Amino acid sequence: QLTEEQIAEFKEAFSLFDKDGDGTITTKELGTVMRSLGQNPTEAELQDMINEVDADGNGTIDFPEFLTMMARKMKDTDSEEEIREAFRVFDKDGNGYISAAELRHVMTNLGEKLTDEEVDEMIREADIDGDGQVNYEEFVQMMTA
Amino acid sequence: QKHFEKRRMPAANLIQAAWRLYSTDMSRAYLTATWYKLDDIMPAVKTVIRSIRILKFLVAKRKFKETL
């Protein structure tokens, strides 16, 4: 389903990690690029990122695994289901809605908290009814599209 | 209650990673002359940033699944 030059684009990203052309990405290469952008992952966080996609077990990401990961993104059945289950954890009503305000409270107070500008952009992207509710099913399908 | 409030931080984490992943391709943070130019001369940079957010989304999805 991917064009021959869209693969060359993902290859350009991959080679930015694998600057020595060994055909693999280790924590070393993944972390060096992340820290060049001003991110600071720990060693354990790098190991977990790589273990999500390493299908062999040697602690690397090779280009076929990279390409599959970039092609799927969030557009898979398991992702839609699990994101839906996350929203439901904060919906005791079960009707399938969450109030704009409760969503803001959960986003800005739990986990890797969103900033005021982030949560404002997210609530703006989801349509709100006359009460203040948002159907997260609609929001989940918009993100996993 | 106590077992299903143990889900709340990894659930929040999964939503946040999903939203940050999704925002790579539509956020106002990228709708600047700087990013259009940077994306013209070096398209690989934005793809790399997006590849990192995918990896973090995957990690966050696994951790939320481990609280079931």
From Swiss-Prot, chain A:
Keywords: Acetylation, Calcium, Cell projection, Cilium, Cytoplasm, Cytoskeleton, Disease variant, Flagellum, Host-virus interaction, Isopeptide bond, Long QT syndrome, Metal-binding, Methylation, Phosphoprotein, Repeat, Ubl conjugation. Ca(2+) 2 binds at residues 54, 56, 58, 60, 65. Ubiquitination results in a strongly decreased activity. Ca(2+) 3 binds at residues 91, 93, 95, 97, 102. Pfam families: EF-hand_7. GO terms for biological process: autophagosome membrane docking; calcineurin-mediated signaling; cellular response to interferon-beta; cellular response to type II interferon; detection of calcium ion; G protein-coupled receptor signaling pathway; G2/M transition of mitotic cell cycle; long-term synaptic potentiation. The modification Phosphoserine is found at residues 79, 99. Homotetramer. Interacts with MYO1C, MYO5A and RRAD. Interacts with MYO10. Interacts with CEP97, CCP110, TTN/titin and SRY. Interacts with USP6; the interaction is calcium dependent. Interacts with CDK5RAP2. Interacts with SCN5A. Interacts with RYR1. Interacts with FCHO1. Interacts with MIP in a 1:2 stoichiometry; the interaction with the cytoplasmic domains from two MIP subunits promotes MIP water channel closure. Interacts with ORAI1; this may play a role in the regulation of ORAI1-mediated calcium transport. Interacts with IQCF1. Interacts with SYT7. Belongs to the calmodulin family. It is linked to Ventricular tachycardia, catecholaminergic polymorphic, 4: An arrhythmogenic disorder characterized by stress-induced, bidirectional ventricular tachycardia that may degenerate into cardiac arrest and cause sudden death. Patients present with recurrent syncope, seizures, or sudden death after physical activity or emotional stress. CPVT4 inheritance is autosomal dominant. This is Calmodulin-1. It comes from Homo sapiens (Human).
Curated annotation (Swiss-Prot), chain B:
Expressed in the outer, but not the inner, sensory hair cells of the cochlea. Slightly expressed in heart, brain and skeletal muscle. It comes from the Eukaryota. Changing residue 55 to D: Loss of CALM binding. Loss of location at plasma membrane. Loss of KCNQ4 channel current. Changing residue 2 to A: Shifted activation curve of KCNQ4 toward positive potentials compared to wild-type. No difference in current density. Shifted activation curve of KCNQ4 toward positive potentials compared to wild-type. Decreased current density. A 1,2-diacyl-sn-glycero-3-phospho-(1D-myo-inositol-4,5-bisphosphate) 2 binds at residue 2. It is found in: Basal cell membrane. Residues 11-20, 50-64 are annotated as: Interaction with CALM. Changing residue 51 to A: No difference in CALM binding compared to wild-type. Mutagenesis experiments were carried out by expressing in Xenopus oocytes KCNQ4 mutants either individually (homomultimers) or in combination with wild-type KCNQ4 (mut/wt homomultimers) in a ratio of 1:1, to mimic the situation in a heterozygous DFNA2 patient. Pore-forming subunit of the voltage-gated potassium (Kv) channel involved in the regulation of sensory cells excitability in the cochlea. KCNQ4/Kv7.4 channel is composed of 4 pore-forming subunits assembled as tetramers. Promotes the outflow of potassium ions in the repolarization phase of action potential which plays a role in regulating membrane potential of excitable cells. The channel conducts a slowly activating and deactivating current. Current often shows some inward rectification at positive potentials. It is linked to Deafness, autosomal dominant, 2A: A form of non-syndromic sensorineural hearing loss. Sensorineural deafness results from damage to the neural receptors of the inner ear, the nerve pathways to the brain, or the area of the brain that receives sound information. Homotetramer. Interacts (via C-terminus) with calmodulin; forms a heterooctameric structure (with 4:4 KCNQ1:CALM stoichiometry); the interaction is calcium-independent, constitutive, participates in the proper assembly of a functional channel. The interaction with calcium-free CALM controls channel trafficking whereas interaction with calcium-bound CALM regulates channel gating. May form a functional heteromultimeric channel with KCNQ3. Interacts with HSP90AB1; promotes cell surface expression of KCNQ4. Belongs to the potassium channel family. KQT (TC 1.A.1.15) subfamily. Kv7.4/KCNQ4 sub-subfamily. This is Potassium voltage-gated channel subfamily KQT member 4. The chain holds residues 332 to 553 of 695 of the full protein.
